[PDB]
Design a binder for this molecule. Structure first.
Ligand SMILES: [Cl-]
Ligand SMILES: [Cl-]
Length: 210
């Protein structure tokens, strides 16, 4: 049986902050044992944990995520516990994120920073859910259209620009119920080439009691 365990974090190479995604249909650790390819899944915060791994040498691969792809060759998993943080370049960084309730409206304000100059902006969205696993993969269907904006053609990222997204609670009382706790998460979807399928970048989850 398995003789090892491994845990660690997906970290921004520049800021050292956790890089969040969606556990399902988001970032993933693809590994190949030396000598059939398995996947190690990552919680939404960017922290990962696996208590069922075999002590061996691997090739690690990152693809179709929300950060620039790369490989880690000759990755040794020792017998027992192992710790390893991966340093990445997200396509987009959400800056100064703020999510607050004013009256009967949830308002998100933020700025964006490109991971590389070539990165453009395709979408922005204020995701909402009844639990902390909120994201593009775990979300409520909302009315009004102000919770999401699509840029076609994809637009330039300028750090000085202030973006605003809104959710009207009265127009969404069916899924955002009065007196209950909800988790809101700012997401930004980049437009990038050679990197396969681009996934959303996120700001940390904000819990609000309605
Ligand atoms: Cl650059
Ligand atoms: Cl609740």
């Amino acid at each position: 049986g398995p003789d090892a365990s491994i845990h660690g974090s997906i970290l921004d190479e520049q800021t050292g902050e956790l890089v969040g995604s969606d556990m399902e249909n988001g970032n993933a650790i693809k590994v190949r044992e030396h000598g059939t390819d398995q996947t190690w899944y990552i919680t939404n915060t960017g922290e990962y944990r696996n208590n069922m791994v075999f002590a061996a040498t691997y090739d690690v691969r990152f693809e179709n995520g929300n950060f620039y792809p790369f490989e880690v060759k000759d990755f040794v998993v020792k017998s027992g516990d192992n710790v390893y943080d991966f340093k990445v370049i997200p396509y987009i960084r959400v800056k100064s994120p703020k999510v607050e309730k004013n009256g009967n409206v949830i308002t998100a304000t933020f700025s964006l920073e490109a991971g590389k100059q070539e990165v453009k902006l395709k979408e922005i969205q204020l995701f909402a859910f009844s639990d902390m696993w909120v994201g593009n993969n775990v979300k409520l269907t909302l009315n009004g259209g102000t919770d999401k904006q699509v840029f076609s053609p994809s637009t330039a990222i300028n750090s000085a620009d202030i973006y605003t997204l809104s959710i009207d609670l009265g127009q969404n009382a069916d899924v955002l119920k009065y007196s209950k706790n909800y988790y809101f998460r700012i997401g930004a979807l980049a437009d990038v080439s050679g990197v396969g399928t681009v996934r959303h970048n996120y700001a940390p989850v904000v819990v609000i009691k309605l």
